[PDB]
Each structure stands twice: as C-alpha cells, then as structure tokens.
Amino acid sequence: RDHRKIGKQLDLYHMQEEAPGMVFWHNDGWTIFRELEVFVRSKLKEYQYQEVKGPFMMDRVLWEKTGHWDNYKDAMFTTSSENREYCIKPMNCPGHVQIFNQGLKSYRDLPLRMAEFGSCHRNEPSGSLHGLMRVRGFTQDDAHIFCTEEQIRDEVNGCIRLVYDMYSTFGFEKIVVKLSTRPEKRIGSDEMWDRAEADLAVALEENNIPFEYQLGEGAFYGPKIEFTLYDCLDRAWQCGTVQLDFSLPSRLSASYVGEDNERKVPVMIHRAILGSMERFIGILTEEFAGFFPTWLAPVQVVIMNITDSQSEYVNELTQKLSNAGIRVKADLRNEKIGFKIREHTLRRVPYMLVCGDKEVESGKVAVRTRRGKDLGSMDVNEVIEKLQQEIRSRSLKQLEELEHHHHHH
C-alpha cells in the first residue's frame, strides 16, 4: 500500500497545488522527521562529524564557477535582489566549501567531516513528482569530507560502514549497490575519472560488497556509489550515496597547507546515508505499511477508558507516561473498547492501555498491541520501563513479538 494513502491515514503531511512538490509536514509526520534527525545526529557524534548550516541561496556567479550552471541549469530555481541573480541551492556542497575556505586550513585539520541536514530545491519536472519520494523541496542528511589522497580509502570505507550501520537499525541488510560512472556532461579529465571510479570500486570490493556498474549515471563532478532501497511496487530509489570529487574544491579555490608547507587542494567525498528525509520516510512508510518502530511512532501509546468512571485514572497515567518521555494520548470517548482499538490500530499506535474498574483498583493496565495481540495486565511501572527500553534501543520489534510488519523478507 502506497505511502501517500498511509500518510493521509496517519495525518503525517499533505501537499497542495499552491505548492507542487512542496511538503506540508503536520505534527505527526514532523515527529518522525525529527526522530530521524536525532538518530542521524547520534551517528554524526559517534563518527566525529561537524554539523553546519549553509544559506538557502547564493549568487549565480558561484554556481557558474562550480559547473552547476552549465550542467545543472534546468533543475535550479533562481531569484533576484537589487539587480543580482541568486540560485536557491540544489546541493549543499558549495556552501560547505565556502565554510572550509574561511580560515587557513592545515593537513592537521583533515579529514574534516562536515555534515548538514541540508534543504535543497530542485525543479523536478511536474510529471516526475511522486509523493514524498520525488518532491521539489527536500532535506538531505548530507556531509562533505575534506581529506588528503592518502585518506580516501579510510574515509570512503567509513561512509560505507555508516550506511550499513544505520540501515541495520531498520532491518535493511541485503542492500542493492551500484557504481554510477562518468556521465556525458561532466567536468574533470578522463584521468581524474579513471582514478575516482577505481577508488570507489576498490572500496566496494575491499568491503566484500557485490555491485553492478551503472554506465553514465554519475554526478557531473564525480562518480557515485548508490545504495538502492525498494518501494511497494519494487521501484528502485536511490537512498544512500557516496561520491568522490576531485573537481569542485579546485573550482572553488579550496586549499590547505601540507606537511612540507606546500599548498594542496583537498579531496572531497560527498555522502548522504538516508538520502533525503522525505524519500527515506516514504520508503519506511511503505516497507512497514505504517507500522513504524516504536521509537519513530508519532503516538507511541494510547490510554483509554471504558466509562467516565476511569477518566481520572487514564488522565493520571497519561501524565505519568508523558513525564517519562513517552508520546502518549488519552482516549476518553464514549465508545466501545473494540471501536477504540480498531481506530488506534488504523492509526498504527504500538500500544493501547485499556483501563477498566479492575485496572483502577490494582493500579495496573490491560495491554493490547496494534498487531492484534493481548499482552494481559502489567504494572504501570513495568510498561514504562519496557517502553523506555524499546525506545532507547530503537528496537525494530515490540514486546513479545517475533516479527515486525515488513514487506521485503
């Protein structure tokens, strides 16, 4: 089932014609986006990345210098102020290079790993738009690594390791990998492309990763390893990408002082792990058919009463779970228990805590899941500890559950 239908069902986002391919993230979809940012940040910390933010627009002159204007013109939105023309950024790399270019850099500063949740706009043909998977405004979990020639192997290897490490959290382990080689419109010499292409192929080989070439699909500035994930119709979507660039730094006058006090141009590795937040959310939505892992679930727990008699109890518990950091909602409606459960199941809420008279008495809760399972009564404190552990460990599967819902086995 399509992520667009599931997105409406869970009130995650919408789009209008007033803004084709521009996403409106509602509260619950934004919750997912934000949790993914937190997850990526935990990895940026561990793998020692800076995190920056570059501006939305820069002078067209800068975009001409990179080769974007010649090779990327059709896709760029432009605007102007006071007789000067600006491009809304389609990529974050040039901004990163401008940051690099502030202050003298030395070999001591390398590898310099510079991440950004970088908002890009690309004027994708309106015929090619597709839900969250192909929009016009999207946010990459981007980074550029500025390094020496001698550091390419280790740094490309690090990016590859990070892809599998992050994808394993979602249960994606058998990943389809491509090496996209020099496109017809490109900058840089043949010799530079032969080297960059060999370097990426050797890294994949060294990591024992099977891949195929994809002829002519590289970026204008360098070849790309692509990590493909599949949607519900098995369409291939580029998500992770690791790219090797011997051209942009030089075009933008990037340099550092080497060990012999000579001026050197840094190599730049580009990579995104999730790809874009929008595309990755669309993929997860379809793969899990909206059964997001508890850490990602917009609403983690719903606590419900049978009658008005338990309203006070449900309210205390909701407050208690909320202070414990759990995303929790009360459902106090005069509706049958089965009716409530069906609704919150369609809403894909991991856990539903049913409070009848006996629950109020014993200070317990009757626990149901969105997979139709009855986990009996549990102590409130026990439920809290078990949920907190499920959240903190970013567990793919629920209490007492063998297999989470996922389309591709």
Ligand X SMILES: C[C@@H](O)[C@H](N)C(=O)NS(=O)(=O)c1cccc(-c2ccc3c(N)ncnc3c2)c1
Catalytic residue (one of 121, 130, 178, 270): 270
Residue 93 annotated to the active site: yes
Among the listed residues 5, 34, 185, 408, the single contact to a copy of itself using CB under 8 A: 34
Contact 353, 317 (CB under 8 A): yes
Q: Which of residues 274-293 bind ligand X (CB under 6 A)?
A: 275-276, 278-279
Q: Does 89 bind Zn ion (CB under 5 A)?
A: no
Tokens for 380, please give them: 């409130």
Closest CA to 95 of 144, 47, 24, 29: 144
Q: For residues 115 and 122, give the distance between their C-alpha atoms in angstroms, rounded to a whole number.
A: 20
Q: For residues 164 and 174, give the distance between their C-alpha atoms in angstroms, rounded to a whole number.
A: 9
Residue 389 annotated to the active site: no
Q: For residues 254 and 145, give the distance between their C-alpha atoms in angstroms, rounded to a whole number.
A: 13
Binding-site positions for AMP: 122-124, 135, 138, 140, 238-239, 276, 279
Helix (H) or strand (E) holding 180: strand 176-180
* Shortest Cβ 90–ligand X spacing (Å): 8
Phi, psi dihedral angles at 207 (to 5 degrees): -85, 10
Cβ proximity to a copy of itself: between 99 and 192 the closer is: 99
Q: For residues 406 and 176, give the distance between their C-alpha atoms in angstroms, rounded to a whole number.
A: 17
Q: Does 30 bind a copy of itself (CB under 8 A)?
A: yes
Q: Does 137 bind a copy of itself (CB under 8 A)?
A: yes
Report the Cα–Cα distance between both ends of the chain, in Å, rounded. 16
* Shortest Cβ 404–Zn ion spacing (Å): 33
Residue 278 binding target from a copy of itself, Zn ion, ligand X, none, CB below 5 to 8 Å by type: ligand X
Binding-site positions: 5-8, 68, 72-76, 84, 93, 101-108, 122-124, 134-135, 138, 140, 144, 221, 238-239, 243, 248-262, 270, 276, 279, 306-308, 334-345, 348, 354-359, 368, 374
Chain centroid, CA 404 distance in Å: 20
Residue 279 binding target from a copy of itself, ligand X, Zn ion, none, CB below 5 to 8 Å by type: ligand X
Cβ proximity to Zn ion: between 275 and 350 the closer is: 275
Contact 94, 248 (CB under 8 A): yes
Residue 276 binding target from ligand X, a copy of itself, Zn ion, none, CB below 5 to 8 Å by type: ligand X
Q: For residues 108 and 159, give the distance between their C-alpha atoms in angstroms, rounded to a whole number.
A: 21
Q: Which of residues 84-123 bind a copy of itself (CB under 8 A)?
A: 86, 88, 95, 98-99, 102-103, 114, 119, 121, 123
Tokens for 339, please give them: 């009716």
Among the listed residues 81, 128, 208, 334, the single contact to a copy of itself using CB under 8 A: 81
Query: Of how many residues is the chain composed?
Result: 409
34's CB contacts (< 8 A; 6+ apart) are: none
Catalytic residue (one of 87, 93, 120, 159): 93
Q: For residues 266 and 250, give the distance between their C-alpha atoms in angstroms, rounded to a whole number.
A: 8
Q: Which of residues 124-183 bind ligand X (CB under 6 A)?
A: 124, 134-135, 138, 140, 142
Catalytic residue (one of 224, 264, 327, 370): 224
- Three-class secondary structure of residue 21 per DSSP: coil
* Shortest Cβ 30–ligand X spacing (Å): 16
Catalytic residues: 93, 122, 140, 142, 144, 224, 270
